[PDB]
Design an enzyme around this catalytic site. Sequence first.
Site, mmCIF file in Angstrom:
data_model
loop_
_atom_site.group_PDB
_atom_site.id
_atom_site.type_symbol
_atom_site.label_atom_id
_atom_site.label_comp_id
_atom_site.label_asym_id
_atom_site.label_seq_id
_atom_site.Cartn_x
_atom_site.Cartn_y
_atom_site.Cartn_z
ATOM 1 C CB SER A 98 -0.987 0.023 1.150
ATOM 2 O OG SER A 98 -1.820 -1.119 1.087
ATOM 3 C CD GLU B 155 -4.904 -2.847 -2.199
ATOM 4 O OE1 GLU B 155 -4.407 -2.004 -1.398
ATOM 5 O OE2 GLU B 155 -4.837 -4.101 -2.040
HETATM 6 C C1 LIG Z 1 -1.980 -2.242 1.873
HETATM 7 O O1 LIG Z 1 -0.798 -2.510 2.094
HETATM 8 C C2 LIG Z 1 -2.994 -3.259 1.863
HETATM 9 C C3 LIG Z 1 -2.689 -4.522 2.066
HETATM 10 N N1 LIG Z 1 -3.637 -5.450 2.051
HETATM 11 C C4 LIG Z 1 -3.239 -6.833 2.191
HETATM 12 C C5 LIG Z 1 -2.869 -7.153 3.600
HETATM 13 O O2 LIG Z 1 -2.896 -6.259 4.449
HETATM 14 C C6 LIG Z 1 -2.456 -8.604 3.877
HETATM 15 C C7 LIG Z 1 -2.685 -9.025 5.328
HETATM 16 O O3 LIG Z 1 -3.769 -8.279 5.915
#
Ligand SMILES: *C(=O)/C=C/NCC(=O)CCO
Length: 268
Positions: A43, A141
């Site tokens: 992110s 995402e």
């Molecule tokens: C931003 O980094 C969003 C990430 N989403 C995936 C996870 O957070 C994996 C484990 O919660």
Amino acid sequence: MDLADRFAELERRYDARLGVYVPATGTTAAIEYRADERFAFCSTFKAPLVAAVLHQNPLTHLDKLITYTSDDIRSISPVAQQHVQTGMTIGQLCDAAIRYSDGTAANLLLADLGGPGGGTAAFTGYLRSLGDTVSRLDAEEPELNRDPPGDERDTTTPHAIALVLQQLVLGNALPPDKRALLTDWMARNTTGAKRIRAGFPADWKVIDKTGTGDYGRANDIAVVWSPTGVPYVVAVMSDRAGGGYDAEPREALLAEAATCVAGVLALE
Ligand SMILES: *C(=O)/C=C/NCC(=O)CCO
């Protein structure tokens, strides 16, 4: 006992690969540890993403209401879930993407920036416009967090993202009004308490953007200010590929790397 040795012991102890970058300043040498190795953005992209949206539009565009449904929510989206029925403005989306790392919010901003299917290329474009020829985004995402180790897709380097962030918060990539929106959102980030924040004294100001992913990925990018207003950029990236896709990330690895940095930066 140079700093590389300290960082090495963090890697052994956490069973992890660590990348650190702190740009050179007028009076401090750069701190670099695997700074030009690639690591997944996760992110952390969402901060330059919000800059791209800000830069390309007047401030009134932040008032534009974006409507979506539950089918758009295919990743962790704490704010998009609360507003599913009523929609979110572009500004609310920038807010959510940064402060809560909202997955759906980043995807909608990617769509605003480059249309459906053009978002990741357009974001990559914004980085190239800033002279970053290294970083790339290729997926939305949640897939972007899930490439295998060594896949160049959806990667940056600590060096590249730190210099991007520097231009955004500390240089003139954004006009002062847009820049302060970006800065304020990162300053009020809610996901970063146990990472770079935890390694700087409470009287240093810290703004940041976290990233977390598969293979135990845990990132943080911050701009910090000394008690008398001296600014630095800190990029801290890590993974633990040995535990496989479901490897647990370790926030305390980032807090420690950041403590090492802060120790150097705060001592006279
Ligand atoms: C931003 O980094 C969003 C990430 N989403 C995936 C996870 O957070 C994996 C484990 O919660």
